């Protein structure tokens, strides 16, 4: 059908705290009883991140930058899917994720997208997202992303690889996050070689979506005997977190510690020189 819902809900961004959620396992190394600090894209802790609901439905487009954290909750009629690309105006290839009850399709191709792409719905129909596709690169199929359990995801694009991470956590508040520390695991690594600049949430038509941009920040990641991350500190978030990261510890002893170096930046830049109007006759050597 490819009905443009044109609802224009225009909800306030309703930003909430990310708390200590937004962390995923950055690499393949097992660690135990150590505090490995690492710089990568994550949500800053306690940053204010938008929680937009389609619920009349909308599919808004946000900057992808270097990766985006996404999480959502739905009632009865469950929404499973995402659109990523450099434009999403059908001139270039893009990444379409359609996730059903038994498996997931993660595909990169040139899609002739609908004005307000939706999954028609007992399974999702891709024709209502886009009417046609060609110039395909790769269709990947694996397990579904299904489990009150918020489905938390991280979408990254590293060295040409699409990286999708996930976890499931119980929800005390429909419009807010479960509090506690997350550590999402990657499920999918796709060697496509295509850039993402724009991210669109893809909805199924019968719807609350938490979306935050990741930032290149250092986190002190505390690893247990299971190889898991059980806690973390967002470095240079506040002075206590600075002290914890500086000291490579999740605790700090009473005292005073040097963590940084303060510099006053210039307000203005002033150029002074002799006034010469004679374009130099080096050109005359050539002539």
């Amino acid at each position: 059908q490819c009905v443009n819902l044109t609802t224009r809900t225009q909800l306030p961004p309703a930003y909430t705290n990310s708390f200590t959620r937004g962390v995923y396992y950055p690499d393949k190394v097992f660690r135990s009883s150590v505090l490995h600090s690492t710089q990568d894209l994550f949500l800053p802790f306690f940053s204010n991140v938008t929680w937009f609901h389609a619920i009349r439905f909308d599919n808004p487009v946000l900057p992808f930058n270097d990766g985006v954290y996404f999480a959502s909750t739905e009632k009865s009629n469950i929404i499973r899917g995402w659109i990523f690309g450099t434009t999403l105006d059908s001139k270039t290839q893009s990444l379409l994720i359609v996730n059903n009850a038994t498996n997931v399709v993660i595909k990169v191709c040139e899609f002739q997208f609908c004005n307000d792409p939706f999954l028609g719905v007992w399974m999702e129909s891709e024709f209502r997202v886009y009417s046609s596709a060609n110039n395909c690169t790769f269709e990947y199929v694996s397990q579904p992303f299904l489990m009150k359990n918020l489905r938390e995801f991280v979408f990254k694009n590293i060295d040409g690889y699409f990286k999708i991470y996930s976890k499931h956590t119980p929800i005390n508040l429909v419009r807010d996050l479960p509090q506690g520390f997350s550590a999402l695991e990657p499920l999918v690594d796709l060697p496509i070689g295509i850039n993402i600049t724009r991210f669109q949430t893809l909805l199924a038509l019968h719807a609350a979506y938490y979306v935050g941009y990741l930032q290149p920040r250092t986190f002190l990641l505390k690893y247990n005997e299971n190889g898991t991350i059980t806690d973390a500190v967002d470095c240079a978030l506040d002075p206590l977190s600075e002290t914890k990261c500086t000291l490579k510890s999740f605790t700090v002893e009473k005292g005073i510690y040097q963590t940084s170096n303060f510099r006053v930046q210039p307000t203005e830049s002033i150029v002074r020189f002799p006034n010469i109007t004679n374009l130099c006759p080096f050109g005359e050597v050539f002539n």
Binding site: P186, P191, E225, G227
Partner: protein
């Protein structure tokens, strides 16, 4: 512009149809996705070995570990991030490197 071929059962060999497949191998500054089968050797325990497990290399002696790794963790590292243990990609088992 397009001329049909008279591919007759009575054609001499030079006029018989042949199927042609051309495999073009393109190497770009992009992830390599079409790979050969790769090579392996027998797993040898309790000896000094030159290792390569799916690109993870170094030297040492392997023994069975007493620890478990996450599904995303194919190897482990110690206090100075040097290899602590590796997992065997054809027989996943965690083997400590000495």
């Amino acid at each position: 512009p397009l001329q049909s071929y008279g591919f007759q059962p009575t054609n001499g060999v030079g006029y018989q149809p042949y199927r042609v497949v051309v495999l073009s191998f393109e190497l770009l500054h992009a992830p390599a996705t079409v790979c050969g089968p790769k090579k392996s050797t027998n797993l040898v325990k309790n000896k000094c070995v030159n290792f390569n497990f799916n690109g993870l290399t170094g030297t040492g002696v392997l023994t069975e570990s007493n620890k478990k790794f996450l599904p995303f963790q194919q190897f482990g590292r110690d206090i100075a991030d040097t290899t602590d243990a590796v997992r065997d990609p054809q027989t996943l088992e965690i083997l400590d490197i000495t």
